[PDB]
């Protein structure tokens, strides 16, 4: 029941000592299903440090302190094992390999593109798959609708402009425009499809008056000649 | 499949036109389309049936 | 990431080509206008 988020809400509300999530046998064990070993760098570890530093005063009303100390012992043991493996890795380095540049350029571009979940090439009907396209379009829409509007830029070429305390250089909004062109092109996607349907169904509905090899055909010329036959009168 | 279209007529003319130039160079067998239509045992059975009709009408 | 970090730390790659946009986004000041809103 969001045991890692309840401590964050109690830290943001500045009232983590009056309730302290009320860790008991029926409350601290229901939200955990021993803490579940969070995987953040410091966003969920400093909260555990503060949660240990606050509860040093009651000293008996919370029973998960032993599990938190065992988790800290596991973290220290993993840190010591990682330092011994880092020493073994730095002592196990061969002297000469002469690593090339082209394979490095192949690895860096692919590892940069695989960070932010986009397509990378190798260079080494159907409604079931359209919902999967719409779920990726709406994902980027909901991602671009969470950016702050007060976004400014700073390039490495501004030092020739001599920006004073009140200067207003003309290279501040070079990324705020590009953060809106994508957001308003993902919304006009259904707008351009109507123009494409009005264009293709007007340039391809005839297809036998401007294209020469389709109007120079023996079947098509005879058909266009024979559909214009006026009905014969009687007597 | 009841009606024909422009692409169907063009593909029909093209498949009827390629098989004529394919037989001059003799890179295709075209014997299964020959023997199954000639069928010499069916031809001699046809001659025996016409002889039987001669024997029945005389 | 650790392997490509240790290659740079140990093998001393001779070129290490720089491919960056030479820019990074920051947060700028927001402020409301000083002319009052008429109704």
């Amino acid at each position: 029941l969001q045991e890692q988020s309840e401590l964050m809400s109690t830290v943001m509300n500045n009232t983590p000592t009056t309730v302290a999530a009320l860790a008991a046998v029926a409350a601290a064990s229901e939200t955990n299903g021993t803490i579940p070993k969070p995987r953040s760098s410091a966003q969920l570890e400093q909260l555990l440090y503060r949660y240990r530093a606050i509860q040093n005063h009651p000293k008996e009303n919370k029973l998960e302190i032993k599990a938190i100390e065992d988790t800290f012992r596991n973290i220290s043991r993993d840190q010591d094992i990682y330092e011994t493996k880092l020493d073994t890795l730095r002592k196990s380095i061969d002297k000469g390999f002469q690593y090339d540049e082209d394979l490095l350029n192949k690895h860096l571009v692919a590892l940069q593109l695989l960070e932010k979940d986009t397509d990378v090439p190798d260079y080494f009907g159907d409604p079931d798959t359209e919902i999967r396209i719409s779920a990726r379009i709406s994902n980027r829409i909901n991602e671009l609708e969470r950016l702050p509007a007060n976004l400014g830029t700073y390039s490495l070429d501004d030092c020739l402009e001599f920006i004073t305390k009140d200067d207003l250089s003309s290279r501040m909004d070079t990324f705020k425009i590009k953060a809106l062109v994508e957001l308003k092109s993902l919304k006009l996607l259904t707008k351009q499809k109507s123009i494409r349907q009005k264009l293709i169904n007007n340039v391809a509905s005839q297809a036998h008056h401007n294209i020469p090899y389709l109007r120079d055909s023996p079947f098509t010329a005879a058909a266009q000649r024979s559909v214009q036959i006026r009905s014969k009168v009687i007597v | 499949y009841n009606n024909v279209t422009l692409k169907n007529l063009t593909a029909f003319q093209l498949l009827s036109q390629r098989e004529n130039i394919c037989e001059l160079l003799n890179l295709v067998e075209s014997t299964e389309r020959h023997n199954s239509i000639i069928n010499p045992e069916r031809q001699r059975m046809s001659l025996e049936e016409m002889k039987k009709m001669l024997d029945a009408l005389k | 990431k650790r392997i490509l970090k240790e290659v740079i730390l140990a093998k001393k790659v001779s070129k290490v080509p720089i491919n960056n946009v030479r820019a990074f986004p920051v947060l700028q000041t927001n402020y409301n206008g000083s002319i009052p809103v008429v109704r």
Binding site: - | L24, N26, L27 | N19
Partner: peptide, 26 residues
Amino acid sequence: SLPIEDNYIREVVSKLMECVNDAVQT
């Protein structure tokens, strides 16, 4: 973890003899 420009990504990213031998003959 630094981004790379798009201009570098876009910069990095028996049937013959079957007729001759027949055309020589026929």
